[PDB]
Amino acid sequence: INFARMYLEQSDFHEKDVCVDRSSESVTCQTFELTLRSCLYPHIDKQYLD
Amino acid sequence: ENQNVNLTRKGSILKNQEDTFAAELHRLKQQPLFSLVDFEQVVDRIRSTVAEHLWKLMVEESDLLGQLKIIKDFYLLGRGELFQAFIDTAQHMLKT
DSSP states (O other): OHHIIIIIHHHTOOOOOOOOOTTSSTTTSOOHHHHHHHHTHHHHHHHHHO | OHHHHHSOSOOOTTTTHHHHHHHHHHHHHHOSSOOHHHHHHHHHHHHHHHHHHHHHIIIIISOHHHHHHHHHHHTTOOSHHHHHHHHHHHHHHHTO
16 A cells, blocks of 8 residues: 555546636626526525525 | 516516527527517517416406406495495585
């Protein structure tokens, strides 16, 4: 295990986003305030109610 | 919208068709020329949907018929015998 960690696990350490771009569905994208109210405010209200 | 502010979460008149009208508007945005005819057609479709849902709300949800019956009985003196007795009682009060 020690040598694995020091050599093989050392060698194999190749252990090397919200796309809020309205451009895709700008016509379908809610208003910034409407988008906020529909994506953030409802979850906050749910947690508040709970 | 103003009624849905006070009314419980009754969905949009267009419900899932709201997005359909959004797609139609996107098509209008995709139209190279503004046509009043196509815009009016889409507007009329939306208007008709809203008007039908509003009629349903008015007749079933808002009981327009009950209110009209009330108006007949009171505003139109539909309870004529009642208002007759009322007049008979109030004649002395209203002469002054």
